[PDB]
Design a protein around this nucleic acid. Structure first.
Ligand SMILES: Nc1ccn([C@H]2C[C@H](O)[C@@H](COP(=O)(O)NP(=O)(O)OP(=O)(O)O)O2)c(=O)n1
Ligand SMILES: [Mg+2]
Ligand SMILES: [Mg+2]
Length: 429
DNA sequence: GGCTCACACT
DNA sequence: AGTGTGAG
Protein backbone atom coordinates (compact mmCIF):
# COMPACT_ATOMS: atom_id res chain seq x y z
CA UNK A 1 0.00 0.00 0.00
CA UNK A 2 1.47 3.32 -1.15
CA UNK A 3 1.58 5.88 1.66
CA UNK A 4 2.15 9.02 -0.40
CA UNK A 5 5.28 9.83 1.60
CA UNK A 6 7.50 10.06 -1.49
CA UNK A 7 7.88 13.85 -1.67
CA UNK A 8 8.47 16.85 0.54
CA UNK A 9 6.25 19.73 -0.57
CA UNK A 10 5.83 23.21 0.89
CA UNK A 11 3.31 25.99 0.31
CA UNK A 12 4.42 29.53 1.19
CA UNK A 13 1.76 32.21 1.49
CA UNK A 14 2.30 35.91 2.29
CA UNK A 15 0.44 37.30 5.31
CA UNK A 16 -2.20 39.92 4.35
CA UNK A 17 -0.12 40.55 1.27
CA UNK A 18 -1.52 43.75 -0.30
CA UNK A 19 -1.56 45.35 3.17
CA UNK A 20 2.11 44.48 3.74
CA UNK A 21 3.00 46.04 0.37
CA UNK A 22 1.31 49.32 1.38
CA UNK A 23 2.75 49.12 4.91
CA UNK A 24 6.29 48.77 3.60
CA UNK A 25 5.79 51.85 1.40
CA UNK A 26 4.06 53.88 4.14
CA UNK A 27 5.54 53.42 7.66
CA UNK A 28 2.51 55.23 9.15
CA UNK A 29 0.42 52.14 8.37
CA UNK A 30 2.71 49.64 10.11
CA UNK A 31 1.38 47.82 13.18
CA UNK A 32 -2.10 49.31 12.80
CA UNK A 33 -5.57 48.12 11.77
CA UNK A 34 -5.62 48.82 8.05
CA UNK A 35 -7.14 47.61 4.81
CA UNK A 36 -6.59 48.00 1.09
CA UNK A 37 -9.57 49.21 -0.96
CA UNK A 38 -10.45 49.89 -4.61
CA UNK A 39 -12.82 52.50 -6.08
CA UNK A 40 -13.05 54.89 -3.13
CA UNK A 41 -16.09 56.80 -4.45
CA UNK A 42 -18.67 54.08 -3.71
CA UNK A 43 -19.30 53.33 -0.02
CA UNK A 44 -15.69 54.22 0.74
CA UNK A 45 -14.43 51.49 -1.58
CA UNK A 46 -14.46 47.70 -1.59
CA UNK A 47 -11.97 46.07 0.76
CA UNK A 48 -9.70 43.44 -0.80
CA UNK A 49 -7.10 42.93 1.95
CA UNK A 50 -7.16 43.30 5.73
CA UNK A 51 -4.40 43.49 8.35
CA UNK A 52 -4.50 41.09 11.28
CA UNK A 53 -5.00 44.02 13.67
CA UNK A 54 -8.09 44.99 11.67
CA UNK A 55 -9.28 41.37 11.55
CA UNK A 56 -9.52 41.41 15.35
CA UNK A 57 -12.34 43.97 15.00
CA UNK A 58 -14.19 41.69 12.59
CA UNK A 59 -13.18 43.49 9.40
CA UNK A 60 -13.32 41.11 6.44
CA UNK A 61 -12.62 41.04 2.69
CA UNK A 62 -16.29 41.20 1.68
CA UNK A 63 -16.97 44.59 3.28
CA UNK A 64 -17.40 48.11 1.95
CA UNK A 65 -14.97 50.46 3.70
CA UNK A 66 -17.82 52.57 5.10
CA UNK A 67 -19.19 49.44 6.76
CA UNK A 68 -15.79 48.29 8.03
CA UNK A 69 -15.39 51.70 9.68
CA UNK A 70 -18.49 50.95 11.75
CA UNK A 71 -16.74 47.96 13.31
CA UNK A 72 -13.33 49.62 13.36
CA UNK A 73 -13.49 53.43 13.72
CA UNK A 74 -9.68 53.83 13.64
CA UNK A 75 -9.25 51.73 10.49
CA UNK A 76 -6.62 53.12 8.12
CA UNK A 77 -7.03 52.68 4.37
CA UNK A 78 -4.70 52.38 1.39
CA UNK A 79 -6.10 52.84 -2.12
CA UNK A 80 -5.28 50.66 -5.11
CA UNK A 81 -3.85 52.81 -7.89
CA UNK A 82 -6.41 53.85 -10.51
CA UNK A 83 -5.45 54.05 -14.18
CA UNK A 84 -7.74 54.79 -17.12
CA UNK A 85 -10.75 54.49 -14.84
CA UNK A 86 -9.72 51.01 -13.73
CA UNK A 87 -7.99 49.49 -10.66
CA UNK A 88 -4.37 48.75 -11.49
CA UNK A 89 -2.61 45.97 -9.59
CA UNK A 90 0.89 46.62 -10.96
CA UNK A 91 2.47 47.40 -7.57
CA UNK A 92 1.36 44.05 -6.15
CA UNK A 93 2.46 42.03 -9.17
CA UNK A 94 5.91 43.60 -8.94
CA UNK A 95 6.08 42.88 -5.20
CA UNK A 96 5.06 39.29 -5.98
CA UNK A 97 7.95 38.98 -8.44
CA UNK A 98 10.34 40.10 -5.68
CA UNK A 99 9.19 37.22 -3.47
CA UNK A 100 9.06 34.57 -6.20
CA UNK A 101 12.60 35.37 -7.34
CA UNK A 102 13.89 34.75 -3.80
CA UNK A 103 12.06 31.47 -3.45
CA UNK A 104 13.35 30.24 -6.87
CA UNK A 105 16.87 30.39 -5.36
CA UNK A 106 16.07 27.46 -3.08
CA UNK A 107 14.07 25.25 -5.42
CA UNK A 108 11.81 25.08 -8.45
CA UNK A 109 8.43 26.62 -7.65
CA UNK A 110 4.88 26.66 -8.95
CA UNK A 111 3.26 30.09 -8.77
CA UNK A 112 -0.15 29.29 -7.31
CA UNK A 113 -1.31 32.90 -7.01
CA UNK A 114 0.00 36.44 -6.71
CA UNK A 115 1.02 35.78 -3.10
CA UNK A 116 1.78 32.06 -2.88
CA UNK A 117 3.88 29.31 -4.41
CA UNK A 118 4.41 25.58 -4.00
CA UNK A 119 7.93 24.24 -3.57
CA UNK A 120 9.25 20.74 -4.21
CA UNK A 121 11.95 20.32 -1.58
CA UNK A 122 12.56 16.61 -2.13
CA UNK A 123 15.96 17.03 -3.83
CA UNK A 124 17.14 19.82 -1.53
CA UNK A 125 16.27 17.66 1.48
CA UNK A 126 18.36 14.72 0.22
CA UNK A 127 21.38 16.96 -0.21
CA UNK A 128 20.94 18.53 3.23
CA UNK A 129 20.55 15.11 4.88
CA UNK A 130 23.87 13.99 3.41
CA UNK A 131 25.60 17.25 4.35
CA UNK A 132 24.71 16.98 8.04
CA UNK A 133 24.70 13.18 7.96
CA UNK A 134 24.40 11.62 11.41
CA UNK A 135 23.75 15.01 12.96
CA UNK A 136 20.66 15.54 15.19
CA UNK A 137 18.38 18.50 14.49
CA UNK A 138 18.27 21.28 17.09
CA UNK A 139 15.02 23.03 18.02
CA UNK A 140 16.84 26.32 17.40
CA UNK A 141 16.74 25.54 13.68
CA UNK A 142 12.93 25.57 13.86
CA UNK A 143 12.05 28.78 15.78
CA UNK A 144 8.65 29.35 14.10
CA UNK A 145 7.57 25.77 13.39
CA UNK A 146 4.44 24.01 14.64
CA UNK A 147 3.99 20.23 14.52
CA UNK A 148 0.32 19.49 13.85
CA UNK A 149 -1.23 17.14 16.41
CA UNK A 150 1.43 17.88 19.03
CA UNK A 151 1.98 18.13 21.90
CA UNK A 152 0.07 15.00 23.04
CA UNK A 153 -0.49 13.28 26.38
CA UNK A 154 1.80 14.37 29.25
CA UNK A 155 1.76 26.42 33.05
CA UNK A 156 4.13 26.67 30.09
CA UNK A 157 1.25 24.99 28.27
CA UNK A 158 -0.92 28.01 29.14
CA UNK A 159 0.91 30.20 26.62
CA UNK A 160 0.97 29.65 22.85
CA UNK A 161 4.75 29.71 22.47
CA UNK A 162 5.11 27.28 25.36
CA UNK A 163 2.75 24.87 23.62
CA UNK A 164 4.58 25.22 20.30
CA UNK A 165 7.89 24.33 21.95
CA UNK A 166 6.50 21.33 23.82
CA UNK A 167 5.11 19.89 20.60
CA UNK A 168 8.35 20.56 18.74
CA UNK A 169 10.32 18.92 21.56
CA UNK A 170 8.11 15.81 21.50
CA UNK A 171 8.55 15.62 17.73
CA UNK A 172 12.33 16.01 17.78
CA UNK A 173 12.82 13.57 20.65
CA UNK A 174 10.99 10.95 18.57
CA UNK A 175 12.93 11.45 15.33
CA UNK A 176 15.43 8.78 14.34
CA UNK A 177 18.33 10.81 12.96
CA UNK A 178 19.92 7.73 11.42
CA UNK A 179 17.73 6.51 8.59
CA UNK A 180 17.90 9.02 5.78
CA UNK A 181 14.80 7.31 4.37
CA UNK A 182 12.35 8.25 7.15
CA UNK A 183 9.57 10.48 5.74
CA UNK A 184 9.25 12.25 9.12
CA UNK A 185 12.95 13.11 9.04
CA UNK A 186 12.57 14.33 5.47
CA UNK A 187 9.68 16.63 6.44
CA UNK A 188 11.73 17.92 9.38
CA UNK A 189 14.69 18.85 7.19
CA UNK A 190 12.14 20.32 4.79
CA UNK A 191 10.90 22.59 7.58
CA UNK A 192 14.47 23.69 8.32
CA UNK A 193 14.91 24.77 4.70
CA UNK A 194 11.54 26.54 4.73
CA UNK A 195 12.59 28.46 7.85
CA UNK A 196 15.67 29.69 5.97
CA UNK A 197 13.58 30.53 2.91
CA UNK A 198 11.07 32.50 4.99
CA UNK A 199 13.95 34.32 6.68
CA UNK A 200 15.45 35.23 3.29
CA UNK A 201 12.10 36.61 2.16
CA UNK A 202 11.64 38.81 5.24
CA UNK A 203 15.23 40.08 5.20
CA UNK A 204 15.27 40.93 1.49
CA UNK A 205 11.71 42.25 1.06
CA UNK A 206 10.48 43.06 4.55
CA UNK A 207 7.42 40.87 3.96
CA UNK A 208 6.34 38.21 6.46
CA UNK A 209 4.78 34.93 5.36
CA UNK A 210 3.48 31.61 6.60
CA UNK A 211 4.16 28.13 5.27
CA UNK A 212 2.93 24.55 5.28
CA UNK A 213 5.19 21.53 4.88
CA UNK A 214 3.86 18.08 4.04
CA UNK A 215 4.08 15.30 1.44
CA UNK A 216 1.72 16.89 -1.10
CA UNK A 217 0.17 20.18 -2.23
CA UNK A 218 -3.24 19.70 -0.61
CA UNK A 219 -1.78 18.98 2.83
CA UNK A 220 0.85 21.70 2.41
CA UNK A 221 -1.85 24.28 1.68
CA UNK A 222 -4.03 23.08 4.57
CA UNK A 223 -1.02 23.14 6.91
CA UNK A 224 -0.14 26.68 5.88
CA UNK A 225 -3.38 28.14 7.22
CA UNK A 226 -3.26 26.29 10.54
CA UNK A 227 -0.97 28.81 12.29
CA UNK A 228 -1.03 32.05 10.28
CA UNK A 229 0.42 34.60 10.57
CA UNK A 230 4.23 34.53 10.56
CA UNK A 231 4.45 30.82 11.41
CA UNK A 232 4.97 27.51 9.60
CA UNK A 233 3.29 24.16 10.21
CA UNK A 234 4.47 20.62 9.55
CA UNK A 235 1.76 18.07 8.76
CA UNK A 236 3.07 14.51 8.90
CA UNK A 237 1.38 11.49 7.34
CA UNK A 238 0.66 10.23 10.85
CA UNK A 239 -1.21 13.37 11.88
CA UNK A 240 -3.75 12.94 9.08
CA UNK A 241 -6.29 10.53 10.68
CA UNK A 242 -6.92 12.75 13.71
CA UNK A 243 -6.67 15.94 11.62
CA UNK A 244 -9.21 14.76 9.05
CA UNK A 245 -11.57 13.34 11.69
CA UNK A 246 -13.03 16.80 12.41
CA UNK A 247 -12.06 18.60 9.20
CA UNK A 248 -15.01 19.97 7.18
CA UNK A 249 -14.94 18.81 3.56
CA UNK A 250 -15.11 22.39 2.24
CA UNK A 251 -11.71 23.07 3.82
CA UNK A 252 -9.84 20.89 1.30
CA UNK A 253 -8.64 22.58 -1.85
CA UNK A 254 -11.05 22.17 -4.75
CA UNK A 255 -13.85 21.02 -2.41
CA UNK A 256 -14.98 24.51 -1.45
CA UNK A 257 -17.64 24.68 -4.17
CA UNK A 258 -20.37 22.55 -5.74
CA UNK A 259 -18.35 19.33 -5.78
CA UNK A 260 -17.72 19.59 -2.05
CA UNK A 261 -21.40 20.30 -1.52
CA UNK A 262 -22.31 17.22 -3.57
CA UNK A 263 -19.97 15.02 -1.52
CA UNK A 264 -21.69 16.17 1.68
CA UNK A 265 -25.21 15.88 0.24
CA UNK A 266 -24.89 12.54 -1.56
CA UNK A 267 -22.81 10.70 1.03
CA UNK A 268 -24.42 12.30 4.08
CA UNK A 269 -21.11 13.14 5.76
CA UNK A 270 -19.47 16.28 7.18
CA UNK A 271 -15.78 15.50 7.69
CA UNK A 272 -12.96 14.54 5.34
CA UNK A 273 -12.16 11.45 7.42
CA UNK A 274 -15.58 9.87 6.90
CA UNK A 275 -14.65 9.44 3.22
CA UNK A 276 -12.49 6.44 4.19
CA UNK A 277 -15.61 4.31 4.62
CA UNK A 278 -16.35 4.24 0.90
CA UNK A 279 -14.79 2.02 -1.75
CA UNK A 280 -12.98 3.65 -4.65
CA UNK A 281 -15.65 2.25 -6.98
CA UNK A 282 -18.37 3.81 -4.84
CA UNK A 283 -16.74 7.23 -4.97
CA UNK A 284 -16.10 7.01 -8.72
CA UNK A 285 -19.72 6.14 -9.40
CA UNK A 286 -20.99 9.25 -7.61
CA UNK A 287 -18.35 11.79 -8.59
CA UNK A 288 -16.68 10.36 -11.69
CA UNK A 289 -13.57 8.29 -12.39
CA UNK A 290 -11.08 11.11 -11.81
CA UNK A 291 -12.79 12.76 -8.83
CA UNK A 292 -13.55 9.39 -7.25
CA UNK A 293 -9.95 8.21 -7.39
CA UNK A 294 -8.74 11.58 -6.11
CA UNK A 295 -11.14 11.51 -3.14
CA UNK A 296 -10.28 7.94 -2.20
CA UNK A 297 -6.58 8.79 -2.01
CA UNK A 298 -7.01 12.28 -0.54
CA UNK A 299 -9.03 11.23 2.52
CA UNK A 300 -6.07 8.99 3.36
CA UNK A 301 -3.70 11.95 2.99
CA UNK A 302 -2.42 10.82 -0.40
CA UNK A 303 -2.21 13.05 -3.48
CA UNK A 304 0.04 12.92 -6.55
CA UNK A 305 -0.51 16.33 -8.18
CA UNK A 306 3.02 17.46 -9.13
CA UNK A 307 4.56 20.82 -8.27
CA UNK A 308 4.65 22.27 -11.79
CA UNK A 309 7.78 24.24 -12.78
CA UNK A 310 5.97 27.45 -13.71
CA UNK A 311 6.97 30.82 -12.29
CA UNK A 312 5.10 32.97 -14.82
CA UNK A 313 1.35 33.30 -15.49
CA UNK A 314 0.06 31.57 -18.64
CA UNK A 315 -2.32 34.41 -19.46
CA UNK A 316 -2.34 38.21 -19.14
CA UNK A 317 -5.74 39.85 -18.86
CA UNK A 318 -7.66 42.94 -17.72
CA UNK A 319 -11.39 43.43 -17.14
CA UNK A 320 -13.94 45.80 -15.66
CA UNK A 321 -17.48 45.38 -14.38
CA UNK A 322 -20.16 47.94 -15.21
CA UNK A 323 -22.99 46.92 -12.84
CA UNK A 324 -26.53 48.26 -12.71
CA UNK A 325 -27.13 51.73 -14.13
CA UNK A 326 -23.49 51.96 -15.23
CA UNK A 327 -23.96 49.25 -17.87
CA UNK A 328 -22.68 50.40 -21.27
CA UNK A 329 -25.53 51.30 -23.62
CA UNK A 330 -23.85 52.94 -26.61
CA UNK A 331 -21.45 51.72 -29.30
CA UNK A 332 -19.12 54.65 -28.61
CA UNK A 333 -19.10 53.86 -24.90
CA UNK A 334 -18.21 50.22 -25.50
CA UNK A 335 -15.41 51.18 -27.91
CA UNK A 336 -13.93 53.72 -25.50
CA UNK A 337 -13.70 51.21 -22.64
CA UNK A 338 -12.31 48.53 -24.96
CA UNK A 339 -9.58 51.04 -25.76
CA UNK A 340 -8.81 51.66 -22.07
CA UNK A 341 -8.50 47.92 -21.40
CA UNK A 342 -6.43 47.40 -24.56
CA UNK A 343 -4.05 50.19 -23.54
CA UNK A 344 -3.31 48.65 -20.14
CA UNK A 345 -2.99 45.24 -21.75
CA UNK A 346 -0.48 46.61 -24.27
CA UNK A 347 1.71 48.06 -21.49
CA UNK A 348 1.70 44.78 -19.60
CA UNK A 349 2.39 42.74 -22.75
CA UNK A 350 5.27 44.96 -23.83
CA UNK A 351 6.89 44.61 -20.42
CA UNK A 352 6.21 40.87 -20.53
CA UNK A 353 7.96 40.51 -23.89
CA UNK A 354 11.05 42.37 -22.68
CA UNK A 355 11.22 40.69 -19.27
CA UNK A 356 10.28 37.13 -20.22
CA UNK A 357 11.23 36.67 -23.88
CA UNK A 358 7.76 35.66 -25.03
CA UNK A 359 4.88 36.93 -27.16
CA UNK A 360 1.14 36.29 -26.93
CA UNK A 361 -0.47 35.00 -30.13
CA UNK A 362 -4.16 34.96 -29.24
CA UNK A 363 -6.55 37.65 -28.02
CA UNK A 364 -9.64 36.62 -26.08
CA UNK A 365 -12.63 38.91 -25.57
CA UNK A 366 -15.37 38.14 -23.06
CA UNK A 367 -18.48 40.11 -22.17
CA UNK A 368 -21.54 39.91 -19.95
CA UNK A 369 -24.95 41.28 -20.91
CA UNK A 370 -27.41 42.70 -18.39
CA UNK A 371 -29.84 40.14 -17.00
CA UNK A 372 -27.48 37.20 -17.48
CA UNK A 373 -26.73 35.17 -14.36
CA UNK A 374 -23.63 33.72 -16.01
CA UNK A 375 -20.35 35.54 -15.37
CA UNK A 376 -19.57 35.48 -19.07
CA UNK A 377 -22.41 35.97 -21.52
CA UNK A 378 -20.08 35.34 -24.45
CA UNK A 379 -16.46 34.47 -25.18
CA UNK A 380 -14.73 34.95 -28.51
CA UNK A 381 -11.12 34.98 -29.67
CA UNK A 382 -9.04 36.40 -32.51
CA UNK A 383 -5.39 36.44 -33.56
CA UNK A 384 -3.07 38.86 -31.76
CA UNK A 385 -0.42 39.85 -34.31
CA UNK A 386 0.60 43.29 -33.06
CA UNK A 387 1.03 44.82 -29.60
CA UNK A 388 -1.03 47.82 -30.68
CA UNK A 389 -3.84 49.01 -28.41
CA UNK A 390 -5.97 50.51 -31.17
CA UNK A 391 -5.82 47.36 -33.30
CA UNK A 392 -6.54 45.14 -30.30
CA UNK A 393 -9.54 47.22 -29.23
CA UNK A 394 -10.73 47.48 -32.83
CA UNK A 395 -10.41 43.72 -33.33
CA UNK A 396 -12.17 43.01 -30.03
CA UNK A 397 -15.14 45.13 -31.07
CA UNK A 398 -15.37 43.46 -34.49
CA UNK A 399 -15.73 40.12 -32.73
CA UNK A 400 -18.51 41.21 -30.34
CA UNK A 401 -20.35 43.81 -32.43
CA UNK A 402 -22.89 41.22 -33.62
CA UNK A 403 -24.03 40.69 -30.02
CA UNK A 404 -25.90 43.99 -30.10
CA UNK A 405 -29.67 43.44 -29.99
CA UNK A 406 -30.72 46.96 -31.03
CA UNK A 407 -31.59 48.13 -34.53
CA UNK A 408 -30.24 51.68 -34.25
CA UNK A 409 -26.58 50.61 -34.01
CA UNK A 410 -25.71 53.83 -32.19
CA UNK A 411 -27.21 52.20 -29.11
CA UNK A 412 -26.23 48.91 -27.50
CA UNK A 413 -28.71 46.32 -26.29
CA UNK A 414 -28.78 44.70 -24.01
CA UNK A 415 -26.35 46.91 -22.03
CA UNK A 416 -22.94 45.38 -21.24
CA UNK A 417 -22.17 44.76 -17.56
CA UNK A 418 -18.63 43.41 -18.05
CA UNK A 419 -15.75 43.68 -20.51
CA UNK A 420 -12.72 41.39 -20.49
CA UNK A 421 -9.59 41.29 -22.63
CA UNK A 422 -7.09 38.44 -22.25
CA UNK A 423 -3.87 37.66 -24.12
CA UNK A 424 -3.03 33.96 -24.36
CA UNK A 425 -1.17 31.27 -26.32
CA UNK A 426 2.33 32.57 -25.59
CA UNK A 427 5.32 31.51 -27.66
CA UNK A 428 9.07 32.04 -27.25
CA UNK A 429 10.59 35.11 -28.91
C1' DG B 1 -19.33 43.52 -3.91
C1' DG B 2 -14.14 43.56 -8.13
C1' DC B 3 -9.78 42.02 -10.73
C1' DT B 4 -7.38 38.11 -11.73
C1' DC B 5 -5.70 33.42 -12.74
C1' DA B 6 -5.77 27.90 -13.84
C1' DC B 7 -8.00 24.01 -15.59
C1' DA B 8 -11.75 20.16 -16.81
C1' DC B 9 -15.28 19.20 -19.94
C1' DT B 10 -17.50 18.95 -24.48
C1' DA C 1 -13.40 26.82 -30.05
C1' DG C 2 -16.39 27.91 -26.25
C1' DT C 3 -18.31 26.92 -21.41
C1' DG C 4 -18.15 26.34 -16.54
C1' DT C 5 -15.95 25.71 -11.82
C1' DG C 6 -12.64 27.00 -8.30
C1' DA C 7 -9.30 30.09 -6.16
C1' DG C 8 -6.82 34.15 -4.32
N1 LIG D 1 -10.76 37.32 -3.41
C1 LIG D 1 -9.47 37.83 -3.32
C2 LIG D 1 -8.50 37.19 -2.57
C3 LIG D 1 -7.21 37.74 -2.50
N2 LIG D 1 -6.94 38.88 -3.15
C4 LIG D 1 -5.60 39.43 -3.09
C5 LIG D 1 -5.47 40.26 -1.86
C6 LIG D 1 -4.62 39.46 -0.96
O1 LIG D 1 -3.89 40.21 -0.12
C7 LIG D 1 -3.76 38.68 -1.86
C8 LIG D 1 -3.50 37.41 -1.25
O2 LIG D 1 -4.65 36.62 -1.02
P1 LIG D 1 -4.85 35.74 0.30
O3 LIG D 1 -3.45 34.97 0.56
O4 LIG D 1 -5.94 34.63 0.13
N3 LIG D 1 -5.22 36.69 1.67
P2 LIG D 1 -4.02 37.62 2.39
O5 LIG D 1 -2.71 37.44 1.80
O6 LIG D 1 -4.34 39.09 2.26
O7 LIG D 1 -4.02 37.29 3.94
P3 LIG D 1 -3.60 35.92 4.58
O8 LIG D 1 -4.83 35.23 5.10
O9 LIG D 1 -3.00 35.01 3.59
O10 LIG D 1 -2.65 36.19 5.66
O11 LIG D 1 -4.58 38.46 -3.05
C9 LIG D 1 -7.91 39.49 -3.88
O12 LIG D 1 -7.68 40.48 -4.45
N4 LIG D 1 -9.14 38.98 -3.96
MG1 LIG E 1 -1.78 35.48 1.83
MG1 LIG F 1 -2.85 33.47 -0.80
Amino acid sequence: MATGQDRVVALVDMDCFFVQVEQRQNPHLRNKPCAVVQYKSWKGGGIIAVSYEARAFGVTRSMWADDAKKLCPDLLLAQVRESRGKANLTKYREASVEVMEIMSRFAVIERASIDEAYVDLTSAVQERLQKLQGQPISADLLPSTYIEGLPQGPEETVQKEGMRKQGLFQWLDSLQIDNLTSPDLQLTVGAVIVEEMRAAIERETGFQCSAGISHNKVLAKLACGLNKPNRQTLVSHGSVPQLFSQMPIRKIRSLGGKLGASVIEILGIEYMGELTQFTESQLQSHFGEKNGSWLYAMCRGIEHDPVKPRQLPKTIGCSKNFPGKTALATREQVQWWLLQLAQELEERLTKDRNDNDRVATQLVVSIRVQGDKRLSSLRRCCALTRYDAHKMSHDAFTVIKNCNTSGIQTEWSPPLTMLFLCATKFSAS
